[PDB]
């Protein structure tokens, strides 16, 4: 795999998984439930493979924060698309997170 | 039960889980790896108990502020690393980002 394509897959898995679990309200359908756990385990594996390459606690927090803001922003657009302050600030936060991951990566000896 | 104590325990379970996940070094240590799975699942369960008494964004704001300091202290303590300039800005972004998004976000329709 490519580590950024795999990261995009992990972001996609987080978006689908949170939404699917929210709709399900628990484990309802067995194949969705097992598949959701497997997609999260595959996503978690990428963090374990990237353990020393970037500082773990800050990296997880930035990825998680970007993820829930992205999930909320996608849900907000589904409710109705607004050029409003939380959506604008959410995009700025995601852009700052992407920039901060580069800065964390380049302040970590490769 | 006491929900404030449960939330503190839920955060502690994540911080210990993340500490075990770093200690496990790419899944090489078997017994911390087994403990890691249990600690995150326990954190999720304690969080599930919490989110019947403290709302999701309110809980996330507390989790974001309290938890980062605790894992950072352990990160210096056992893994010998210091927060550099972009990591400090990242911590500021995590701390203030939840508050501004939660303040300016608009209510769910359903
Ligand atoms: C397990 C179950 C729920 C959460 P989260 C959350 C999900 C994704 C990214 C960031 C946060 C949540 C999301 C939507 C509905 C309910 C719960 C979560 C974590 C800590 C504190 C509050 C909320 C976390 C782990």
């Amino acid at each position: 795999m490519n580590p950024y394509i795999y990261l995009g897959g992990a972001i996609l898995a987080q978006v689908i998984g949170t939404t699917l679990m929210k709709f399900s309200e628990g484990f309802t359908r067995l194949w969705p439930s097992v598949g959701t756990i497997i997609c999260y385990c595959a996503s978690f594996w990428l963090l374990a493979q990237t353990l020393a390459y970037i500082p773990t606690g800050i990296a997880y927090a930035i990825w998680s924060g970007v993820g829930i803001v992205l999930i909320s922003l996608l849900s907000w657009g589904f409710f109705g698309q607004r050029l409003d302050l939380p959506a604008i600030i959410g995009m700025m936060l995601i852009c700052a997170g992407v920039l901060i991951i580069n800065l964390l990566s380049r302040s970590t000896p490769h």
Side-chain angles (χ1 to χ4, degrees), chain A:
Chain A
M1 291 185 200
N2 171 286
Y4 305 113
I5 300 177
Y6 189 7
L7 186 67
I11 298 162
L12 177 63
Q14 182 59 292
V15 170
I16 302 164
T18 290
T19 304
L20 181 57
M21 285 293 165
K22 162 165 293 190
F23 179 69
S24 308
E25 296 175 50
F27 303 127
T28 51
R29 299 188 68 171
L30 177 64
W31 304 114
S33 292
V34 176
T36 304
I37 295 167
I38 292 170
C39 294
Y40 284 125
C41 295
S43 302
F44 185 63
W45 188 259
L46 180 56
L47 178 57
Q49 295 312 311
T50 317
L51 190 75
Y53 301 157
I54 192 170
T56 326
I58 182 64
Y60 177 50
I62 295 292
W63 179 91
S64 184
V66 163
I68 194 56
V69 170
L70 179 58
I71 290 160
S72 304
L73 181 58
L74 293 168
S75 195
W76 298 337
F78 170 72
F79 303 151
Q81 291 167 111
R82 306 299 169 233
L83 289 79
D84 195 357
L85 302 175
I88 298 164
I89 298 169
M91 287 191 162
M92 293 292 172
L93 184 146
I94 298 166
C95 295
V98 172
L99 173 58
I100 288 172
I101 293 291
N102 176 242
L103 298 160
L104 291 169
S105 181
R106 300 313 188 186
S107 57
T108 303
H110 300 310

